[PDB]
Amino acid sequence: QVQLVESGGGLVQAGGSLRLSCAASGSIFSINAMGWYRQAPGKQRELVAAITRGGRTNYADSVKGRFTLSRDNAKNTVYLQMNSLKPEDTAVYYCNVGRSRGYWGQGTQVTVSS
Amino acid sequence: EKDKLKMEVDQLKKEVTLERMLVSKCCEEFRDYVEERSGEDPLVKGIPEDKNPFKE
Amino acid sequence: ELDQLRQEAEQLKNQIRDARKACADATLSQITNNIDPVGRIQMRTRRTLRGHLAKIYAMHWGTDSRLLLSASQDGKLIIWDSYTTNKVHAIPLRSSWVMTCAYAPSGNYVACGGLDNICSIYNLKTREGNVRVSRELAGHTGYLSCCRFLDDNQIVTSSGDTTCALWDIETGQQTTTFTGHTGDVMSLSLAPDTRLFVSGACDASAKLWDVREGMCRQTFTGHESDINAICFFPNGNAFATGSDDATCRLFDLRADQELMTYSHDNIICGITSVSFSKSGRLLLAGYDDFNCNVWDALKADRAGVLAGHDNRVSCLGVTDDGMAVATGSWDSFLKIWN
């Protein structure tokens, strides 16, 4: 009886932009922190951008300044705006609440070509 | 934040005084606990089909 | 002054490390060198509990070793009779974003919660046939990661707000708060005698807490990533951890340190759950890769595997009589093995 729905991935040219969304079936983002993770072909899953319940963001060093994580509680959605993309950002991006004990989306593939 | 560093050192200060047993003696007692009981552990030994509460 | 404190903390860390180093006189593998390997452990599926419609996140055995309950994102909290497979109850949840559940020792209540940040207590034998929420335990500002009853009136909880708490169920109040963890607390386990409990967290550390005093006695380090699961050893002087770093570890309280690590270099995915067998000879661990590994707790080798879920094993549990291991999975089934 729950849905964590990601959207917005695909293929983009290096330096271009993608707007990943993550839409919850309930108001979970309004009383918990969430995290965006990514997993490239045959590496480990890593954190990319996280947001506390009160709105403090925090990013991995490889994306700092290019990736901005925002939130619209009134429609149970968070957004990861990814600008000036590079080849090494190519991966499957996952929406998460509750960490490894928690809720994950299916993954959105992001492909960055040069 | 200074609030917290003080509680962190207060906890570290308590942990520095802990009387620690030798790892060998801990490992010995651990072993002997397991050795006393593992012959009787149903998941080590196996359960006879008559005594298995999860029969067919 | 932030400088004089970080400088003191640093010196205290080094001094704890040297004191621990000067105690580590021998490894567990030396101590158990006379001991022979256990057999190949080859447990079989005795039951497949069918009923949940989506991922199972948690489960817990009742103290009678027959009744268990399970919590899924499907919105249901099912109490099963493992002997028959008959559902004793199928409780609909207000919030389906469930992350834990607990069976009270008495058999009279279960508890449950998750991204609602609330630990809900459910009364199992009421006046008239219904199963209703007798108490909601609100106060945490982040998700409920785990919960364990001490008795019918007391329950300990862990949370993504970085704290654990002891609650009085009658009053609904937090009697005690346990602070110290610098990251989300993902799991906890009560000592056999319930005077202590251990918690594991995203700070990569585990802490031992005195329930009655409300304070951390001991912090245990070594893990390189989140501690997702934790379980007391049955004599009460040790516990095991499962982590995203792909290791389980065995920590002794009196040594204040790690005795043993359980990992293969070709397993690099996360651990979800850990449980000792009755005697402690076996340490069972669930993984992201769909399997449970059965480890020889004394010899640090893998003794066997439980392979029979089509998605990850999210939770497991050994009965108090030691006769069975329950697994729960993201494929929506629980399995009973022995």
CATH code assigned at C181: 2.130.10.10
For an interface test with C, give the residue of B23, B32, B52 to mutate (most C CBs within 10 A): B23
The Cα–Cα gap between A95 and A76 comes to: 13
Q: Which residues contact A4 (CB under 8 A, 6 or more apart)?
A: A22, A23, A24, A25, A95, A97, A103, A104, A105
**Nearest one of A42, A50, A58 to A92, comparing CA atoms:** A42
Is C268 close to A44, i.e. CB distance below 8 A?
yes
Contact B51, B42 (CB under 8 A): no
For residue C216, the enclosing domain spans 1-338
Contact A10, A16 (CB under 8 A): no
Structure tokens at C138: 């609100």
Name the neighbours of B, counting chains with at least 3 Cβ pairs within 8 A.
C
Q: What's the angle, vertex CA C135, arms to CA A29 and CA C95, rounded to 5?
A: 30
- Could you say which of C74, C96, C202 has the minimum Cβ distance to residue A99? C202
Burial group, residue C22, by CB count within 10 angstroms (0-12, 13-18, 19+): exposed
Count other C-beta atoms under 10 Å from residue A60's C-beta: 15
At A17 the three-state DSSP class reads: coil
For an interface test with B, give the residue of C209, C218, C252, C282 to mutate (most B CBs within 10 A): C252
Q: Which residues contact A54 (CB under 8 A, 6 or more apart)?
A: none
The Cα–Cα gap between A2 and C74 comes to: 7
Contact C191, C232 (CB under 8 A): yes
Is A32 close to C228, i.e. CB distance below 8 A?
no
Task: Give the chain C residue nearest B28 (alpha carbons).
Answer: C31
C-alpha R_g of chain B: 22
Query: From which experimental method does this structure derive?
Result: X-ray
The Cα–Cα gap between A79 and A61 comes to: 19
Angle of the B2-16 helix axis to the C2-21 helix axis, nearest 10: 20
The Cα–Cα gap between C72 and C301 comes to: 32
Contact C152, C133 (CB under 8 A): no
- Could you say which of A2, A33, A100 has the minimum Cβ distance to residue C142? A33
- DSSP, res A54: T
Count other C-beta atoms under 10 Å from residue B1's C-beta: 7
Contact C99, C115 (CB under 8 A): yes
Size of interface B-C (CB pairs under 8 A): 156
Contact A8, A93 (CB under 8 A): no
C-alpha distance from C10 to closest chain B C-alpha (Å): 9
Q: How many domains does chain C have?
A: 1
DSSP-derived pairing of the beta strands C164-168 and C98-103? unpaired
Provide the b/e sequence for A24-34 (b: ≥16 CB within 10 Å).
bebbbbebbbb
- Could you say which of C96, C141, C228 has the minimum Cβ distance to residue A101? C228
Name the CATH superfamily housing domain B1-56: Transducin (heterotrimeric G protein), gamma chain (4.10.260.10)
**Nearest one of C242, C310, C239, C312 to C273, comparing CA atoms:** C242
Distances (CA, A) of C183 to A23, C153, C158, C285, C293: 25, 28, 11, 23, 28
Contact C330, C311 (CB under 8 A): yes
How many residues in chain B?
Answer: 56
